[PDB]
Design a protein around this ligand. Structure first.
Ligand SMILES: *[C@@H]1O[C@H](CO)[C@@H](O[C@@H]2O[C@H](CO)[C@@H](O)[C@H](O)[C@H]2NC(C)=O)[C@H](O)[C@H]1NC(C)=O
Ligand SMILES: *[C@@H]1O[C@H](CO)[C@@H](O[C@@H]2O[C@H](CO)[C@@H](O)[C@H](O)[C@H]2NC(C)=O)[C@H](O)[C@H]1NC(C)=O
Ligand SMILES: *[C@@H]1O[C@H](CO)[C@@H](O)[C@H](O)[C@H]1NC(C)=O
Ligand SMILES: *[C@@H]1O[C@H](CO)[C@@H](O)[C@H](O)[C@H]1NC(C)=O
Ligand SMILES: *[C@@H]1O[C@H](CO)[C@@H](O)[C@H](O)[C@H]1NC(C)=O
Ligand SMILES: *[C@@H]1O[C@H](CO)[C@@H](O)[C@H](O)[C@H]1NC(C)=O
Ligand SMILES: *[C@@H]1O[C@H](CO)[C@@H](O)[C@H](O)[C@H]1NC(C)=O
Ligand SMILES: *[C@@H]1O[C@H](CO)[C@@H](O)[C@H](O)[C@H]1NC(C)=O
Ligand SMILES: *[C@@H]1O[C@H](CO)[C@@H](O)[C@H](O)[C@H]1NC(C)=O
Ligand SMILES: *[C@@H]1O[C@H](CO)[C@@H](O)[C@H](O)[C@H]1NC(C)=O
Lengths: 245, 105, 49, 310, 79, 49, 126, 49, 49
């Protein structure tokens, strides 16, 4: 019982090193297809922060997870900025989660005035004013709740039984780095043409010692044509100058 | 900024007190005004700054503020006090008015 | 006027056009140089006295 | 005494966390316009000021009566509110709900670090909130002029970029009860910077103040010689909007095609021509759930406002 | 109405006063609807090339310094 | 603009933008050569005068 | 101290009107004044305001049509109404506001409330 | 090709109903228009139409 | 390269390649004209000498 499709819980994950091999050790995925980055190279990347948005939808709702397929549940509940770095997971663990009469604890808000902004969780409960009558709490004609009751029966087919889905979201920022893939950090060398993989700044060149200032917040060097001519060591906090071979 | 009044319909008799209240959306400190609109003639100002008096009327009228919720108090609802009541915010340039409150015998 | 010729008034067209780097500046510089040369040409032909 | 004083050229800060040796960058961000006015609040005190885009809280007192600030939207028990408070040797931040500093029931957020008042004297604090973040930049400098902002240049450096994710619309100052400042607002502008030799900003120019500044911003330089240099264009802006859809008002049925029985087989399909009407597609939503509303031609959102032949 | 603008200035070393030329708007027709703080006046002059704001019109004649167009120049003389 | 949302309007906008840029480049490319020829003629005229 | 209005009438759509609010004991040279429109039985709605300094700030709805203007002395300000959309048929009042300063980079915020009200004039559109 | 429909079937054998629209986006003839409040006409000032 | 597999990286690589080629062509196109002008000046200098 993570959450309903509306009022979804948001989990922020940072300050760790984690591997995505463990997620393979899990229930079979209804749709491992995902939008942002190739799953193979996810294991070797560095991140600023990550987010997890886990909730429940229906089968007819699993096809609109992508930003461009809105219209049914994304209309008033959950929207994306159409960029959406990172990607989603679905594993339909509803099999051991249902009710003979119906799951009344899961709701979605369909009686909302208009479209919502991306990454929005409205929580107010106000009477729907569809019509021309001054609703004051009567809850009759032109007066509706911002909720839609429904039940789940396990005898149903696909499209009526529940399903579970979690959504990630990345940023690929450069300055702050808290989440990185598990790799064996190697000893540092210098004064010879080598490949370097400082936090993901994959490149080739020679590394020397520099006299740059690099105030504590600053940690990258830049110049014309977006070439990183200097870099701060992640571990020993030593500044290094990069020169092409 | 949106304000709502409650209750909208007031029905009492002589020698009673009012308990209509105004509910805001953002924070407007203590800047709110209570206006009396006669049925047709012109509005009249009673309470400004949510606690003060314009000195036109006696101490029968008073205004209390708590957080961002405001309440109006009338010592004795004499027969000549029968009109519409409005709460208006003044924290910003763009003034806003309430839907209105009806007083009934 | 490059930004008005390519896109009439829509702002998103301008936003897309900024992704193409500095292409308008080169055209503006070339046209201004041509205009200045044209102004100078008719001077040394006549202004000899 | 809310008198107004000139702010001269002050309020710039490092926009990005990268190092540039000697360039002339051109950014575009929220700033404090040059040669603006700011509202002195010599102190019944402590007004609840608005928070539009940012604040440039500057102070010049030494006795440290000025504790932290309070940020909120409702400033009541309905919405969360920041509670920045400076300790004797610590800094405390809370986010979740408050009533009157006295409940703090729902939620709890915390972060501690070194004070903000280590050190007449002059202090600056820039407050910005974008994409669910909270950026504050500070820099302390000594002057002895008095109750006026010095006509000098000094950039700011970031302190913390903690993420919160809260609407912010109201801003209040908090002082110690038992035992004065300036406020100016930020607007979106375009600047040009002067990283000297060590990422130290030594000069800056605002590209929307005077024509000379506009020219200095067109070509990236701080000195211009005699010329007739060109700049941006100008265009008159519209005022009103007019729409004239046709005279007719009758509503074509558009419905019997939708509710019926035994329409036709897949071959020998019946073809219905609809014209000479004004119709809305909202009534289509008032219908049975659609197996596939996905469709090819035009975006369904703007279908409601279009004109067709047939 | 639309058009372009040009800035007539002497060197930043000599001074900081400038003048503004609007490209063919016939001045009074639509001179001004921030950056437009130039009094919407102060000796507005009309020429064959556009509207010149910020310069006088001397009856004298000297050598051209900053070309403008249609036989009109500008300078930074001292009264 | 009032036919499609941005996500699949960007392709059309980009196609039009690149076409217009390609059409605009040729104008200045020809203008430079024509100006060079006119400058040669002007130099000859100055010499004759 | 009293102020009264004039200039109403029945005007066809897409016309022009010019209402006048004349005051006796309130100088218009240095004061804050405002206009309030009341549709029949639909409540009140502020539509325009002019400050002591001389700036103006109209409501979002009636923008680009109405125009408030102040007379140099003579204590009679003028509100000019341009093209009408058969909705502005309502009763108009002019009033005076207490005060509030001029936080730069924003508008005027701290106001107290109106003090003196007129009887208003009715404007109708056929 | 004769066939039958049995309600006990799953998706792919049970019937389905579909309606198809088709537009032209022509300019000269206009008979079907969306519901909007026609506003008054103005002139001699820069406006949106 | 270290973000995507080739099948949908080829489109980005191609976009960058065509942009860079378009940016590179203009350089030599302008250089040819500038060289022609300098050659004319050099011939004049040789004649004067
Ligand atoms: C100011 O700092 C003092 C410590 O310098 C804080 O007191 C400590 O607070 C923590 C957290 O509750 C306790 O675990 C310690 O036992 C406290 N120590 C002492 C000596 O009091 C104090 O809470 C801070 N207050 C503010 C307002 O920042
Ligand atoms: C950039 O940093 C260098 C090194 O700190 C600065 O050079 C110093 O300048 C001061 C000014 O007199 C000298 O006292 C120091 O001896 C210099 N440091 C040396 C020679 O190593 C330089 O001024 C800085 N650039 C600025 C501030 O724009
Ligand atoms: C700034 O304040 C001064 C002092 O009153 C005033 O003269 C000036 O007009 C103000 N500037 C602005 C832009 O409001
Ligand atoms: C948090 O707020 C909700 C909504 O008002 C309330 O029901 C709940 O009791 C609160 N939690 C507390 C007071 O611990
Ligand atoms: C923040 O405010 C905006 C506009 O006032 C609103 O749309 C949004 O829902 C608010 N944020 C939350 C989390 O409710
Ligand atoms: C249709 O035209 C007639 C004649 O001009 C006019 O009287 C009528 O108001 C028009 N209808 C609409 C809805 O504009
Ligand atoms: C018309 O459609 C409605 C659905 O809103 C349906 O209930 C009704 O039966 C239909 N009419 C007929 C004659 O079937
Ligand atoms: C600026 O002008 C002064 C006097 O005219 C001269 O001495 C100085 O060298 C000039 N500056 C430059 C950079 O040429
Ligand atoms: C500018 O407009 C005025 C009035 O229409 C006219 O008299 C004048 O000749 C115009 N100037 C030019 C250069 O056309
Ligand atoms: C200056 O020139 C104008 C242009 O017509 C002329 O009318 C005027 O008489 C001249 N004045 C003098 C003193 O030359």
């Amino acid at each position: 019982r993570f959450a309903s499709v509306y009022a979804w819980n948001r989990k922020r994950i940072s300050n760790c090193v984690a591997d995505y091999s463990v997620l393979y050790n899990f229930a079979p995925f209804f749709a491992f297809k995902c939008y942002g980055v190739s799953p193979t190279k996810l294991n070797d990347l560095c991140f600023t922060n990550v987010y997890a948005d886990s909730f429940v939808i229906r089968g007819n709702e699993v096809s609109q997870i992508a930003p461009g397929q809105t219209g049914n549940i994304a209309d008033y509940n959950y929207k994306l900025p159409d960029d959406f770095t990172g990607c989603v997971i679905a594993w339909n663990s509803n099999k051991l989660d249902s009710k003979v009469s119906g799951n009344y604890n899961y709701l979605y808000r369909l009686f909302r005035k208009s479209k919502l902004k991306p990454f929005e969780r409205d929580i107010s409960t106000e009477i729907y004013q569809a019509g021309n009558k001054p609703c004051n709490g009567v809850a009759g004609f032109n007066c509706y709740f911002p909720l839609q009751s429904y039940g789940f029966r396990p005898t149903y087919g696909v499209g009526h039984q529940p399903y579970r889905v979690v959504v990630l979201s990345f940023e690929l920022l450069h300055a702050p780095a808290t989440v990185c893939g598990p790799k064996k950090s190697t000893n540092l060398v210098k004064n010879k043409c080598v490949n370097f993989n400082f936090n993901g700044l994959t490149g080739t060149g020679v590394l020397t010692e520099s006299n740059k200032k690099f105030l504590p917040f600053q940690q990258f060097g830049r110049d014309i044509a977006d070439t990183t001519d200097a870099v701060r060591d992640p571990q020993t906090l030593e500044i290094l100058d990069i020169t092409p071979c | 900024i949106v304000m709502t009044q409650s209750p909208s319909s007031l029905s009492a008799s002589v020698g009673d007190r009012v308990t209509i209240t105004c509910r805001a959306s953002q924070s407007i400190s203590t800047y709110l005004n209570w206006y009396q609109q006669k049925p047709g003639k012109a509005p009249k100002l009673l309470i400004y700054a949510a606690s003060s008096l314009q000195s036109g009327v006696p101490s029968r009228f008073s205004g209390s503020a708590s957080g961002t919720d405001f309440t109006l108090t009338i010592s004795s609802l004499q027969p000549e006090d029968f009109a519409t009541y409005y709460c208006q915010q003044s924290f910003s340039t763009s003034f806003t008015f309430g839907p209105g409150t009806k007083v009934d015998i | 006027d490059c930004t008005m010729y390519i896109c009439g008034d829509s702002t998103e067209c301008s936003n897309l056009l900024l992704q193409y780097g500095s292409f308008c500046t080169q055209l503006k510089r070339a046209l201004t140089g041509i205009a200045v040369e044209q102004d100078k040409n008719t001077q040394e032909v006549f202004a000899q006295v | 005494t809310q008198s107004y004083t000139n702010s001269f050229t002050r309020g710039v800060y490092y926009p990005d966390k990268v190092f540039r040796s000697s360039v002339l960058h051109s950014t575009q961000d929220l700033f404090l316009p040059f040669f603006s006015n700011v509202t002195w609040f010599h102190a019944f005190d402590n007004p609840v000021l608005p928070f539009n885009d940012g604040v440039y809280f500057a102070s010049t007192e030494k006795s440290n009566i000025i504790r932290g600030w309070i940020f909120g939207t409702t400033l009541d028990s309905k919405t969360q509110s920041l509670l920045i408070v400076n300790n004797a040797t610590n800094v405390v931040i809370k986010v979740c709900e408050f009533q009157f500093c006295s409940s703090a029931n729902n939620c709890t957020f915390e972060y501690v670090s070194q004070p903000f008042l280590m050190d007449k004297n002059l202090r600056e604090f820039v407050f910005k909130n974008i994409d669910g973040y909270f950026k504050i930049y500070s820099k302390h400098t000594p002057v002895n002029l008095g109750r006026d902002l010095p006509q000098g240049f000094s950039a700011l450096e970031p302190l913390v970029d903690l993420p919160i994710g809260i609407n912010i619309t109201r801003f209040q100052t908090l002082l110690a009860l038992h035992r004065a400042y300036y406020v100016g607002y930020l607007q979106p502008r375009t600047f040009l910077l002067k990283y000297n030799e060590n990422g130290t900003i030594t000069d800056a120019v605002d590209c929307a103040l005077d024509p000379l500044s506009e020219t200095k911003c067109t070509l990236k330089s701080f000195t211009v010689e005699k010329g007739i240099y060109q700049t941006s264009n100008f265009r008159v802006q519209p005022t009103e909007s007019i729409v004239r859809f046709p005279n007719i008002t009758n509503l074509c049925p558009f419905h019997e095609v939708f509710n019926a029985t035994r329409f036709a087989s897949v071959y020998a399909w019946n073809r219905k021509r609809i014209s000479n009407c004004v119709a809305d597609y909202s009534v289509l939503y008032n219908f049975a759930p659609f197996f596939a509303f996905k469709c090819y031609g035009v975006s369904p959102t703007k279908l409601n406002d279009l004109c067709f032949t047939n | 109405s639309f058009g372009g603008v040009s800035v007539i200035t002497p060197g930043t070393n000599t001074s900081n006063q400038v003048a503004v030329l609007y490209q063919g708007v016939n001045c009074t027709e639509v001179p001004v609807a921030t950056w437009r703080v130039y009094s919407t006046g102060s000796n507005v002059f009309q020429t064959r090339a556009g509207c010149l704001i910020g310069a006088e019109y001397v009856n004298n004649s000297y050598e051209c310094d900053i070309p403008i167009g249609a036989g009109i120049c500008a300078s930074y003389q001292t009264q | 603009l009032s036919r499609l949302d941005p996500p699949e309007a960007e392709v059309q906008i980009d196609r039009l933008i690149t076409g217009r840029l390609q059409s605009l480049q040729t104008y200045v490319t020809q203008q430079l050569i024509r100006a060079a020829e006119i400058r040669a003629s002007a130099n000859l005229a100055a010499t004759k005068m | 101290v009293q102020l009264v209005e004039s200039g109403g009438g029945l005007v066809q759509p897409g016309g022009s009107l010019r209402l006048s609010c004349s005051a006796s004991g309130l100088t218009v040279s240095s004061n804050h004044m405002t206009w309030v429109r009341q549709a029949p039985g639909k409540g009140l709605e502020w539509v325009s305001v002019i400050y002591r300094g001389g700036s103006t700030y109209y409501a979002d709805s009636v923008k680009g049509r109405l125009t408030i203007s102040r007379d140099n002395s003579k204590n009679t300000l003028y509100l000019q109404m341009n093209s009408l959309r058969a909705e502005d048929t309502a009763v108009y009042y002019c009033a005076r506001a207490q005060g509030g300063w001029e936080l730069p980079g924003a508008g005027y915020y701290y106001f107290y409330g109106m003090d003196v009200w007129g009887q208003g004039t009715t404007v109708t559109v056929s």
